[PDB]
């Protein structure tokens, strides 16, 4: 397991735009395209992320191009955050996938403002902090996904994703 496999086992992969967990035009494995309520909109966006005439629709080398690029911008945005860069650092690599995987799905400003729970990561107090990450609109809105980013954090190991 790693970050990759991790977070094509929480977004899925799908060749057609679709409509996230918040309603949102979406493709590939996890990219937003816009929070637009405008297909038209979201389907530009699309044409720009790929740079051919798609209407609507790509392939999984495509998909996959975009995954690895959204994958890279979330790493390298933590490490350029104030906020999260010490996070990052001071976390084993199991355990900075887990915060990945969370800027990956609610941005890098969204994560930045769990500030007790990111001081309490920081501290290694891991229990705790997985307490503190549950009580969010995130673990409301997508609880088994965050209940498996949590366990991550709360245990740096990977026993929330063997075997999905
Ligand atoms: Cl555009
Ligand atoms: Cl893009
Ligand atoms: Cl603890
Ligand atoms: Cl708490
Ligand atoms: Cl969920
Ligand atoms: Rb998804
Ligand atoms: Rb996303
Ligand atoms: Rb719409
Ligand atoms: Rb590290
Ligand atoms: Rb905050």
Redesign the pocket.
């Known amino acids: 397991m790693n970050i990759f496999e991790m977070l094509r086992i929480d977004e899925g992969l799908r060749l057609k735009i679709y409509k996230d967990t918040e309603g949102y035009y979406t493709i590939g494995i996890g990219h937003l395209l816009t929070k637009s309520p405008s297909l038209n909109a979201a389907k530009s966006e699309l044409d720009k992320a790929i740079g051919r005439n798609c209407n609507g629709v790509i392939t999984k080398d495509e998909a996959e191009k975009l995954f690895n690029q959204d994958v890279a911008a979330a790493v390298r945005g933590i490490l350029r955050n104030a906020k999260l860069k010490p996070v990052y650092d001071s976390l084993d690599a199991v355990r900075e996938c887990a915060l990945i995987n969370m800027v990956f799905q609610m941005g890098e400003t969204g994560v930045?403002?769990?500030?007790?729970s990111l001081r309490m990561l920081q501290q290694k107090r891991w229990d705790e902090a997985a307490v503190n990450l549950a009580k969010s609109r995130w673990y409301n809105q997508t609880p088994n996904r965050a209940k498996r980013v949590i366990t991550t954090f709360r245990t740096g190991t990977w026993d929330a994703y063997k075997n999905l």
């Open positions: 930045a403002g769990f500030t007790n």
